């Protein structure tokens, strides 16, 4: 690893993801290979989120990836803000197809015709379906592994309800699960808020989101989305149910949709990584503890003690690997598993082995702890938990010191250009948000809105005006440069 | 269910997969929706197979779905066979791309360029990667859900080895796992064999496969394949490693690939499905036991009735018997009886007021329909024994139908006659591609194709035996018959 994070973040990020064996590059621009080390992190996210939504009654399924040309021309609002982001398949080999079919940028147009057929009575509600699949979102920006990719893995849940009350409560419930994925699994603090009318999901009623901050570049990034679609989609696809008491009365269902992608892994890398490579939170680390024989007569004695620790950690269900390979130097193994971000390195040397003790090296801080043999299960469990909270507390210390309030325009400008995100009084108008992005690049890149936070840092002053100095302010809005 | 299995099988198949809430149709032909009832079966197959390949050192990953045209044409024999069924992306919205890119029909040409970068030394081998993903093969033949789809889910494992012995060993290991999936999980007997030169994976060395038989249609179907690719792909993508003992020497890696698709669910539906609907083998049954309260006057005693269903729901979970208590008060019990019958739940547990007073209940088997009156005492043990008896009964019934419609034929006179009986035949075959085309041509005057060259044939081919054509010597018994 040659590049430094605080200097050239782009070169550092490329070396960290590749030398840790997370990502390989593909011949198709914007497409990246998810190697096992990174795929296991997605599986840890998948295992947590799947078990949580099944408590809410959500069931897993799989819908086709192709969208017909007629189905996309259904909702006029959903097709406009998505057509340039859709790749079309027009031929099979040397034979043109009947009609050009589209690769899914999202599965609203695929599932909701089926929802209309499944929903006829009030007993058929609520429908709660989820799928883990890939999605092709063609775009024109600069692709980045995990962060901005033309193909990415995600889950997308789509729920239909008989009332808007229950639909509104699922939006926040799923958004809170997304917050737990970032805060409790990846040790990343997020800000929960609402998207502005300019950046909300097209055709939906409102979009909620979680925003994470990357202090290495001073830019924020959207971590997830939970949309309330209202009856907009159910009216165009005719998702209607019969009234359970009023004979013959039919009502359009209230729908939601929510997604979480593999950019979680990229935000984990950007926030926690250092100049020695990746840093994995123990909650999602494929290997939490790596056992390395040091000082490698009684050679079989040292190897069997490594196997004793390996099985003792498996009994308390700690993900452990014993690198017993004789082809590489111990110092080589030290650097190999540090680049890969293993939270704890367990070193067993001949002297320590005969003393019934070992050395545990913390990946986050580099601290070396000498631990006795009998305390291996309890101590290593305590260090792993201490690593998880340390990563979260240090990440939140960056968020608290890089998100502040500004009530005028150029103080919002002055704080922004120092690598921060700012909450400002905003009128919420779309034409005003265009001027903000143009002025932020005028007086780099132009700052766009991130979210209208639920719990802002400060409450709005009575009668406070927007930063544009032309319309009254509706709410504090978190602005800043974004990926 | 409208149609019946013995009559219009295609109509029966559509009814059973939709009324069981497995498949919903899409407005694009060949593409189908995997509803949660069908997806749970795929998840059960995934959990078994994934754990088995982890023991062999295989690791999960995910490669991109797009293929460049330069990488696709790196192996000429491989691209020549998949070319007509490759879906090509040619436009981004309303703008035509300068160079079109392809949707993967398979991931050999996607992964092996990455294998070349990862393999430099002998320590880099073996590589054993697997991915659970979707794939697109645009077959213009009349599609059918699960059996013949344009897009389907599968797993594909790709392994590279330093030697041929270990590579050849993995081929038979993965093949036996595919056999376990059909026989142990889905209760479907299969025949292990090698595909002919005409039907093997183009570009590979040899293809092993498992062939199942559908007695309702008399046709056989390929249930999965495990290919030995040899060095044909490593030579084209330059997957080379330095010799561990000879300085400067490099050798090409020996590669394998193996895939199992959602066709498994279709075969399970075709083999075990009856006129009452789907029939799930208890090994992959999302719900093995469904509790339905039946007998609805006294609201005070009905309160203890739902408590009895929850009582059975709780203690059945102690032995981890997947049990669901259908306690919905917005549907008739008779509606729930036929609803869970269509879905194929192996056992229906009916709770009645009189049965509660007599300290008894009634268990209904899905495969046989035998309504058996059991007691509260042996509720956990006998429902466990009935589940295992259902799995064996389904497998025995499908094995007897296979052992009945798979016979040996030493003459085209016998081969075409027993082919009209809705059967499959093992005949002495020379293995020539031109002869396999002649066999397919003369059996339509509905043409029969080659299925597999069985490892354990019905009879042994002794020297002096000629092929069914008569122009060349026969080298092995080959299972023929009409296929999907
Ligand atoms: O694309 C989106 O943002 C929503 C959420 C997942 C499904 N559609
Ligand atoms: O398509 C096939 O049949 C082989 C096996 C899985 C990957 N490629
Ligand atoms: Sr549900
Ligand atoms: Sr009305
Ligand atoms: Sr109404
Ligand atoms: Sr491995
Ligand atoms: Sr040589
Ligand atoms: Sr050589
Ligand atoms: Zn304004
Ligand atoms: Zn012949």
Numbering used by the authors:
A (entry chain A): 1016 to 1311, 1318 to 1464, 1473 to 1512
B (entry chain B): 1016 to 1311, 1315 to 1463, 1474 to 1512
What are the paper's exact sentences on this?
Human cytosolic prolyl-tRNA synthetase (HcProRS) catalyses the formation of the prolyl-tRNAPro, playing an important role in protein synthesis. Notably, glutamyl-prolyl-tRNA synthetase (EPRS) is a dual function enzyme that catalyses the formation of charged glutamyl-tRNA and prolyl-tRNA in the cytoplasm. The human ProRS (HcProRS) activity is located at the C-terminal region of this protein and inhibition of this enzyme has been recognized as a promising approach for treatment of HcProRS-related diseases. Inhibition of HcProRS activity has been shown to have potential benefits in the treatment of fibrosis, autoimmune diseases and cancer.
Pro binding induced the movement of the side chain of Arg1152 out of the ATP binding site, providing additional space to accommodate the binding of pyrazinamide derivatives.
